[PDB]
Design an enzyme around this catalytic site. Structure first.
Site, PDB file in Angstrom:
ATOM      1  N   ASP A 176      51.647  41.529  48.132  1.00 19.82           N
ATOM      2  CA  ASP A 176      50.588  40.944  47.718  1.00 19.82           C
ATOM      3  C   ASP A 176      50.022  41.461  46.315  1.00 19.82           C
ATOM      4  O   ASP A 176      49.383  42.517  46.200  1.00 19.82           O
ATOM      5  CB  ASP A 176      49.160  41.163  48.600  1.00 19.82           C
ATOM      6  N   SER A 215      45.499  29.910  32.000  1.00 19.52           N
ATOM      7  CA  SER A 215      46.380  28.824  31.947  1.00 19.52           C
ATOM      8  C   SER A 215      45.847  27.957  30.707  1.00 19.52           C
ATOM      9  O   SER A 215      44.554  28.101  30.612  1.00 19.52           O
ATOM     10  CB  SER A 215      46.446  28.152  33.180  1.00 19.52           C
TER      11      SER A 215
END
Ligand SMILES: [Br-]
Length: 330
Positions: A35, A199
């Site tokens: 994770d 992004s």
């Protein structure tokens, strides 16, 4: 040193991925959920409340000659989905794909919430976010990656998650045969303890690319892609019959639909998530309403590039002094 381990979807929907991990001496092999959105290595154990164990493999520290109780240390963690676990702490030898760390904090669960109990395939979590998020008290502990880093050939790990197929976590090297084209690197902020990046925008299907900054985290422990409501609305508007359902808890769409791809920007590069990756199947057994793999982050407080996004790429988690993230197509 390096390590290389295969990671395998737990079910037919790629809800999560498990990777075998050797703990203790002689080795006890547990299947852990790696994770990159948390920083605790915790396991089901001989200390876990018996009624809360349902088919998991447990770590038994008393059977390990290298286990030592970390005196006074406790841990307690809550995840974004509302699940939780807590307990006490051992140090022991931990190996992943041939890479060994001695003195790793292995957090032994005394209590786990129902979602963990109900998932018989996940024996615990191995956190790969920054050690500043580790929950051990009163002395915070380091992640497996942070402990391994000095020994690694290069201070990196890579995530290569499969779509309905096994994939790979590598430590200490970049497998140049595992991706196509080049790797595009982008800046990381560790201010929140996550692999947080921005992004450069998105496209829906064959549509034009929208240049826009989307700050989010690369999180292998989250199944879906959670993005701003504006972006998610633009995506589902291209799917006949799609709608946001408060009763179901997100966007649903007719199972008969063909889903468009979703593209996200990494610098000047583009990663394309095929439409198939976005179909998470019937909302309940036998239903013709299907659950979407792109959902709004509006109720979360952070955008999350979960498995839906990451499995479309070869992803480099560069833990150099100035951390960065790399993405390549594959
Ligand atoms: Br680059």
């Amino acid at each position: 040193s390096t390590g290389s381990a295969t990671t395998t979807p737990i079910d037919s929907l790629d809800d999560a991925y498990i990777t075998p991990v050797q703990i203790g001496t002689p080795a006890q092999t547990l299947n852990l959920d790696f994770d990159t959105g948390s920083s605790d290595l915790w396991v089901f154990s001989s200390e876990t409340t018996a009624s809360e164990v349902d088919g998991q493999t447990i770590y038994t520290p008393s059977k390990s000659t290298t286990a030592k109780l970390l005196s006074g240390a406790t841990w307690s963690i809550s995840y974004g989905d509302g699940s939780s676990s807590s307990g006490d702490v051992y140090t022991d030898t931990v190996s992943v794909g041939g890479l060994t760390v001695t003195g790793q904090a292995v957090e032994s669960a005394k209590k786990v919430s129902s979602s963990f109990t109900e998932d018989s395939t996940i024996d615990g979590l191995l956190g790969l976010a920054f050690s500043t998020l580790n929950t051990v008290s009163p002395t915070q502990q380091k992640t497996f990656f942070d402990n391994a880093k000095a020994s690694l050939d290069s201070p990196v790990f890579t995530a290569d998650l499969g779509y309905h197929a096994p994939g790979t976590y590598n430590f200490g090297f970049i497998d140049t045969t595992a991706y196509t084209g080049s790797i595009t690197y982008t800046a990381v902020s560790t201010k929140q303890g996550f692999w947080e990046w921005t992004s450069t925008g998105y496209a829906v299907g064959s549509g034009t690319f929208k240049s826009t900054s989307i700050d989010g985290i690369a999180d292998t422990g989250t199944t879906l892609l959670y993005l701003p409501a504006t972006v998610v609305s633009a995506y589902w508007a291209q799917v006949s019959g799609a709608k946001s359902s408060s009763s179901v808890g997100g966007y649903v769409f007719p199972c008969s639909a063909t889903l468009p791809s979703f593209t996200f920007g990494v610098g000047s590069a583009r990663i394309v998530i095929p439409g198939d990756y976005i179909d998470f199947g019937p909302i309940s057994t036998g239903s013709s309403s299907c659950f979407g793999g792109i959902q709004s982050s509006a109720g979360i407080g952070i955008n999350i590039f979960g498995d839906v996004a990451l499995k479309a790429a070869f992803v480099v988690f560069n833990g150099a002094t100035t951390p960065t993230l790399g993405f390549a197509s594959k």
